[PDB]
Write a protein that binds this ligand. Structure first.
Ligand SMILES: *[C@@H]1O[C@H](CO)[C@@H](O)[C@H](O)[C@H]1NC(C)=O
Length: 246
């Protein structure tokens, strides 16, 4: 398991949590020095538990699929909550079984569905450590509209930050003041599958992407990533979605 406490949190302790999160994901191989997530894992070993504590010390446990860093569901006191999607129902066979009741959320976990339920795109939702504290608090008591927004915050400040060093740094900058994600942050989130694929395809193509990936950089400028010498590959991305899952 991995843990993070918002009480006394600072950029350093958050950095340690994201490091722990990355290190908890198993891999058998690196591709261009980036850990390659496994094609599959059987049984309960598929799911990592993240223990998150809000400023007041109240806690949720979040179940994460270690093959893709997708959040499946979470436990809040004696109630479990899972996304309305087959991967999450499968996860519900293995985690939080001791919950007194299980609620299936009225949406799947993908960004589009969550944004619909929340009533806003995540371009408009501030993120940061304060937002994460709020998210944890919201998820403690069932409110499906509120929870959609909370989950958009949770996903970005945990799994997204684990996937990209740039996103981890963006959250560290927002340790004591929330701010909506940079356009670059959004671009990277949207491009993780694509980038993971092209980095793997580059292995037998001399480091060259079969299809270029278009990203927005820090300055709001749109750019093309064509090969593994790019900063996105050498410095930024920290985990690869296995091409078998793409
Ligand atoms: C590869 O990408 C680098 C970094 O952006 C770029 O400067 C270069 O033009 C590209 N080289 C090849 C061979 O595609």
């Amino acid at each position: 398991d991995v843990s993070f406490r918002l009480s006394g949190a600072d950029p350093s302790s958050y950095g340690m949590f994201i490091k722990d999160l990355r290190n908890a994901l198993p891999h058998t191989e690196k591709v261009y020095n980036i850990p390659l997530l496994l094609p599959s894992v059987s049984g309960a070993g598929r799911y990592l538990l993240m223990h998150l504590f809000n400023y007041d010390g109240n806690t949720i446990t979040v179940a994460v699929d270690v093959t893709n860093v997708y959040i499946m569901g979470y436990l809040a006191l004696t109630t479990s909550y899972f996304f309305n999607e087959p991967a999450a129902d499968l996860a519900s066979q293995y985690v939080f079984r001791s919950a007194r009741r299980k609620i299936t959320l009225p949406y799947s976990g993908n960004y589009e569905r969550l944004q619909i339920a929340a009533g806003k795109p995540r371009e408009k939702i501030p993120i940061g450590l304060p937002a994460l504290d709020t998210a944890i608090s919201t998820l403690l008591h069932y409110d499906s509209t509120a929870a959609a927004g909370a989950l958009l915050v949770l996903i970005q400040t945990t799994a997204e930050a684990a996937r990209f060093k740039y996103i981890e740094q963006q959250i560290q900058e927002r340790a004591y003041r929330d701010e909506v994600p940079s356009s670059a942050t959004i671009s990277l989130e949207n491009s993780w599958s694509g980038l993971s694929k092209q980095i793997q395809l580059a292995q037998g193509n001399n480091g060259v992407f079969r299809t270029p990936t278009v990203l927005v950089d820090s300055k709001g400028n749109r750019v093309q990533i064509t090969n593994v010498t790019s900063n996105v590959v050498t410095s930024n991305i920290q985990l690869l979605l296995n091409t078998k899952n793409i």
